[PDB]
Ligand binder design. Sequence first.
Ligand SMILES: Nc1ncnc2c1ncn2[C@@H]1O[C@H](COP(=O)(O)OP(=O)(O)NP(=O)(O)O)[C@@H](O)[C@H]1O
Ligand SMILES: [Mg+2]
Lengths: 334, 96
Amino acid sequence: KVITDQDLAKIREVAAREDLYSLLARSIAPSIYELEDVKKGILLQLFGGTNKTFTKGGRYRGDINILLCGDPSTSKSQILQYVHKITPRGVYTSGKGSSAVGLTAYITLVLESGALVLSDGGVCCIDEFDKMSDSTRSVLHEVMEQQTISIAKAGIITTLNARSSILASANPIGSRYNPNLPVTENIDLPPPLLSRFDLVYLVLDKVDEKNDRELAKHLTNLYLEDKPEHISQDDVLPVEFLTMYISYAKEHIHPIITEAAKTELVRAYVGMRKMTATTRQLESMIRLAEAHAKMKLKNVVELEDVQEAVRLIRSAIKDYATDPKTGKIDMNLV
Amino acid sequence: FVILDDCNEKIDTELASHIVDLHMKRDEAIEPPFSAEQLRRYIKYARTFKPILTKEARSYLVEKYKELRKDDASYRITVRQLESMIRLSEAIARAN
Ligand SMILES: Nc1ncnc2c1ncn2[C@@H]1O[C@H](COP(=O)(O)OP(=O)(O)NP(=O)(O)O)[C@@H](O)[C@H]1O
Ligand SMILES: [Mg+2]
């Protein structure tokens, strides 16, 4: 394919650092400037929740689905490149490149695999998500909710497993974010599909001289050398070691809910609910908190993890800057 | 059957607790009245009954159907609703 006690010592020693969460996040995509919250959310998608199966009452998904939405030139697609190369298994694809059959499975009498099936247990990166038709996007409802694919065609009828995490990229209606429309109307996905993402990010091309000088200095510094040694930050982890950390934490660590975490989750859900938050906001909060716990090599979910899960959800969709009644965003607060 | 969110704090506070319990304990939360292998044996037994419509029930059915027709006078209520109501009553008697 393309362990030792020293590796365990290194992993345990790194896990004791105070700046661990920021260190890991800024190290998944070293040359990309800022976008810290986006990097953090992607890191938690890499770790994932915990998988659960009951004797009866079913099984519950550990995987996280993320949507990146916003202005052009904001470097969304560049981030999808890093995720596609970091993940052990996965696929990158485009909206105009995909059919309903190609995305799931194909009759040929034999059955054949599509992208979401090849990507099982990994991450499936979908770019230009706003270009594919309502017919093709309707296929994703069942696979995202259940993590299974049911088929019933001439001579073949069966169900297949798809433990696949989706990372999506799109631009708003009108192709540049319009502040005179509410956020849900700018995003323009129908509610049954928009309800299935754990995190939704707004990223905006806001002009600012302070930001622009730093961005310009960062991009122009890459052309001072033939094959650059330069990198955005002094301390980042090598890709190999980072992969080792993530892989080990996925295999050995399995956090559980503490009573304290249960009380905070109930309180937080009632807070978002009483005023719109659906029942899926609760489950996605649980899943994000579990992902945060694995990343610290803990066996228990605690109050700190729940509060981080809540904070990241509020930060992603620019809620603090949102008018609570009209649903428009004040660009001055960004 | 039409399902609606109907947001209410007194329901949300309980529903959230139920959901968090399912993620906190795997098997323990549900505590059903019967075992599945018990329930299937009961359902197999029940389907052997072939109940018969009582005289008073025949008199009562036309009154209830007239009430539905006057409510109707929304999908328009046809003779098929009476036939369906008879089917449901057969199933209810069989359940008992
Ligand atoms: N913060 C940033 N860090 C690094 N490169 C950036 C940044 N912002 C913009 N760029 C550069 O600007 C370009 C962005 O291209 P791209 O990744 O396609 O952005 P995008 O969000 O996908 N825009 P679009 O495809 O039009 O919706 C690339 O050359 C990036 O290197
Ligand atoms: Mg792009």
